[PDB]
Nucleic acid binder design. Structure first.
Ligand SMILES: [Cl-]
Ligand SMILES: [Cl-]
Ligand SMILES: [Cl-]
Ligand SMILES: [Cl-]
Ligand SMILES: [Mg+2]
Ligand SMILES: [Mg+2]
Ligand SMILES: [Mg+2]
Ligand SMILES: [Mg+2]
Ligand SMILES: [Mg+2]
Ligand SMILES: [Mg+2]
Ligand SMILES: [Mg+2]
Ligand SMILES: [Mg+2]
Ligand SMILES: [Mg+2]
Ligand SMILES: [Mg+2]
Ligand SMILES: [Mg+2]
Lengths: 132, 122, 122, 122
RNA sequence: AGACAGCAUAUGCUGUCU
RNA sequence: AGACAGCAUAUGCUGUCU
């Protein structure tokens, strides 16, 4: 039982994002998208455990999960310089409703560490970036 | 004045029923009573109403500035499951963070019969 | 590119509608275009975005550093009364100082039917 | 110009309401008035604005440099308690230092009904 | 839906201290 | 550069009333 008590495996990107979702208010907000985006980059970087630990450390300072994710996007080394992923959509009406008003023209050189979550591209080759 | 008598006075100033603010008023009233600052708490609450702000603003202000409350951890409240949490409180439940305090808006920690927990956040 | 088309492009980078930054975009687009410096203004804007600053920061920076704006008096715009100013701008209205300029964050001077003036500040 | 009218004039240049700068504007207007220097005070304020400085910077500068304010003790303002202090000033209350003076950025000393003091600092 | 209220985040501008 | 503060905008969450 002691092995079972103390064993803490690294989480998959999907399990990581699900844990984050439990601390966030609402559903399909820009923070939910960021949680999925960051979880994927953290995982592929081999930093799933470090990222989750850093997330909890910020929370333990009294900050909520929204403040934690934006701080991590700013400071966590696996995110520095990283470009937001491009996501194909039929059109921009397809972007989750609570995200739509956070859409902006793509700047020339968008990065996660400046608050750019993802870039949506439509079937017409148009693009918008999701900004927190 | 008792913890329960205090809480009902506050209820007369709050819109609706069993909202997060109702729970907060109950949680604060108990802590205030136990610290012996039950009188001082109510006066502070009235003082703020006089200044033109409402009850919600009074409770959040007091929860952040009232001596008795600063640093205090939200209490654990047993429920059968999270759908027996009062309905106007259910969409304000989150995972419990490591160090919740009432002065940041954490009202209480609900624990289920499975030993799972959620925190009520204003 | 016309002043009008310049402002429409800048609007694609801006959050909200009719904010003080929308007004500033329109005011700077007109001044830039009249200076014959429309191409240079748009290039300097993009160059700033490309350094990682957002569009709001780029417009205030251009207002402070783009030669064609230094010491320029904000344009006077006639309005029925200050309730007619766009809602998101009304809280940013101040008494007109002596010697307002664009480079110090003064966007425009609203002039009411009754002859009073307020200046919009970013 | 009376202390009240002077403060009213200054208020038209300030953002928000009941900020520490509104309290300073009232404090300085009274001191200038009492010393027969309201005219010179208003002129010095306008002069600084006409250099492109904003109203907040003008008031902090005048508090430091205008002769009528040098070494003046901030006025003591009696209040029920510190919840009575305007909300935008509350986070700017500090312990009263040794020898508070207007020219070192201390605006006023609030004295609670229970004999405690805190000073408002810009 | 809207109005109001409370909470949070991001950005800009300003001021003070180190 | 950081800490803190003030003001504004934008967005999101929750509650009530209609
Ligand atoms: Cl219980
Ligand atoms: Cl005063
Ligand atoms: Cl007199
Ligand atoms: Cl007197
Ligand atoms: Mg299609
Ligand atoms: Mg009620
Ligand atoms: Mg919008
Ligand atoms: Mg008006
Ligand atoms: Mg004002
Ligand atoms: Mg929260
Ligand atoms: Mg500074
Ligand atoms: Mg210093
Ligand atoms: Mg020093
Ligand atoms: Mg809402
Ligand atoms: Mg709601």
């Amino acid at each position: 039982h002691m092995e079972e008590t103390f064993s803490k495996p690294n989480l998959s990107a999907k399990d990581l994002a699900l844990l984050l979702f439990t601390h966030l208010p609402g559903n399909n907000t820009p923070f939910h998208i960021l949680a999925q985006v960051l979880s994927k980059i953290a995982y592929k970087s081999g930093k799933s455990g470090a990222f989750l630990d850093a997330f909890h450390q910020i929370l333990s300072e009294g900050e909520n999960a929204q403040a934690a994710l934006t701080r991590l996007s700013r400071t966590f080394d696996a995110f520095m310089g990283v470009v937001p992923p491009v996501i194909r959509v039929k059109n921009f009406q397809t972007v989750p409703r609570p995200c739509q008003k956070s859409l902006r023209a793509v700047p020339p050189n968008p990065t996660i560490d400046k608050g750019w979550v993802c870039v949506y591209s439509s079937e017409q080759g148009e693009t918008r970036a999701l900004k927190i």
